[PDB]
Amino acid sequence: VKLVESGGGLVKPGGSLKLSCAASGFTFSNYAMSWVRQTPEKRLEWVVSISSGGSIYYLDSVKGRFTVSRDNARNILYLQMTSLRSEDTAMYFCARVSHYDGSRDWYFDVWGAGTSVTVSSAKTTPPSVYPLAPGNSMVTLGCLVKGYFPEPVTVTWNSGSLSSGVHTFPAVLQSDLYTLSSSVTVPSSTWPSETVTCNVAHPASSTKVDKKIVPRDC
Amino acid sequence: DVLMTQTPLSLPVSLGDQASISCRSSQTIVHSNGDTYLDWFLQKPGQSPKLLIYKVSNRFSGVPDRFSGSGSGTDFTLKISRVEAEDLGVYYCFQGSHVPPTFGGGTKLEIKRADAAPTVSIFPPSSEQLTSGGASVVCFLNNFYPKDINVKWKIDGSERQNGVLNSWTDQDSKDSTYSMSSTLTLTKDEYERHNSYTCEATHKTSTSPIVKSFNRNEC
Numbered sequence A: 001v002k003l004v005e006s007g008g009g010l011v012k013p014g015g016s017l018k019l020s021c022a023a024s025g026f027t028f029s030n031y032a033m034s035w036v037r038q039t040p041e042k043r044l045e046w047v048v049s050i051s052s053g054g055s056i057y058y059l060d061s062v063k064g065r066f067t068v069s070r071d072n073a074r075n076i077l078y079l080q081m082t083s084l085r086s087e088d089t090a091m092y093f094c095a096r097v098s099h100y101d102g103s104r105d106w107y108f109d110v111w112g113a114g115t116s117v118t119v120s121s122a123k124t125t126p127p128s129v130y131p132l133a134p135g136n137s138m139v140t141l142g143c144l145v146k147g148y149f150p151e152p153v154t155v156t157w158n159s160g161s162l163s164s165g166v167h168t169f170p171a172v173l174q175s176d177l178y179t180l181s182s183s184v185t186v187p188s189s190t191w192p193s194e195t196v197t198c199n200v201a202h203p204a205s206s207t208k209v210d211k212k213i214v215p216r217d218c
Numbered sequence B: 001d002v003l004m005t006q007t008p009l010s011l012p013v014s015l016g017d018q019a020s021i022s023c024r025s026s027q028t029i030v031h032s033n034g035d036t037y038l039d040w041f042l043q044k045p046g047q048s049p050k051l052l053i054y055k056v057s058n059r060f061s062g063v064p065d066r067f068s069g070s071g072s073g074t075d076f077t078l079k080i081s082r083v084e085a086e087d088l089g090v091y092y093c094f095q096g097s098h099v100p101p102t103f104g105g106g107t108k109l110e111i112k113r114a115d116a117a118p119t120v121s122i123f124p125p126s127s128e129q130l131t132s133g134g135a136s137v138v139c140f141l142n143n144f145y146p147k148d149i150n151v152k153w154k155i156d157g158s159e160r161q162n163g164v165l166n167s168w169t170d171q172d173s174k175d176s177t178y179s180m181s182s183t184l185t186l187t188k189d190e191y192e193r194h195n196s197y198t199c200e201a202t203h204k205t206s207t208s209p210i211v212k213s214f215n216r217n218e219c
Ligand SMILES: CCNC(=O)N(CCCN(C)C)[P@](=O)(Cc1ccc(NC(=O)C(F)(F)F)cc1)O[C@H](c1ccc([N+](=O)[O-])cc1)[C@@H](CO)NC(=O)C(Cl)Cl
Pocket: A032, A033, A034, A046, A049, A050, A051, A052, A053, A055, A057, A097, A099, A100, A101, A102, A103, A106, A107, A108, B032, B033, B095, B096, B097, B098, B099, B101
């Protein structure tokens, strides 16, 4: 039994997008299906259920904008989204409800891996990278990755060489852009003596900035 | 709609302990057909939710004996007799009796460890950024426990909230500690108008707030 959703991507506020959920390993038509979303904040929210017989139930805030439909001959569940807005940003999950019309039982027993949907006015942008050097047994250094889009960014220290003592913080969205920082701790007898560089890589733009961390007086 | 409330938000347990999670609904969850559709899910990082308990107390197939559910009307509980490593994650309760079906906010199960004081570090803005007109002062507070920590920024003695951006990591799989980043961003212009930039954190491991300062006239 498998559910595979597709169609996710970046859309402008007010735009439209259609998601697909391909089912396999079970008689699609004998089950109710549902789409559930998980917001960036990690909150789970039910969006719509369509019963095996075809009864449809929607969340009030999408009624009139989202249309669910199913193609029983092809084992596919759809979600046509329109007049999208920022609040629609989330990971969309396709889920099977162990229910057929009339049954006293219903619960989500099978979930897809989810497809991501981002509603925003923004263009693929490289991040500005800034070295963080201090102005002790060990020394902590960092890299500030500011103003980039979209997610994600990759941060390494000395090409994976430095793996332990590293802390990469999750990106925060501010003023429509993401900011991330990363720290690394090393023995005071390692830097400045030996070099220390944070390797920043923004897959989207194939960007690869190497920022050497040099000692500096503020 | 029916509001589902979970308590606690985070639950520190030691491996082998017994965990109990509460879930309260704003109204009765009993359906007109006499049944109660209260379900429980476990979500581990990078995976989608997984059904554990359906209709208050039935275990879904493949779900170990250690999990049990009970409750009625508006109060329900999930209990894990013996917490194993594979049980770490975020548990969600859900009511499917009424439209719209709704989920509780979630309860994160974390590992308990000894209290540890944060190692604080402050960084002045780099010359590269100042060349752009911007000036971010960064504060790292690493490897502390518990997660509860309060960080305030003070410039020449006055608290500042505008232009502060905080990010917290999840529990470290190795030492079970938490780390936090706090960035005060201002303009090169205002930055050069002040002298004392202070990052101060209050944590249970210390009576005095933990302070770290940078003075532009001692560089
Ligand atoms: C207006 C017509 N009336 C009703 O509609 N209902 C009776 C309401 C009675 N009160 C007003 C007093 P209701 O209870 C409304 C309801 C809808 C969805 C869900 N849950 C989920 O969607 C999930 F997310 F939790 F799964 C829970 C309740 O329908 C039930 C239902 C359950 C599951 C599914 N499904 O999974 O698709 C569809 C419908 C059930 C009767 O019971 N019907 C059917 O089996 C018909 Cl024969 Cl199809």
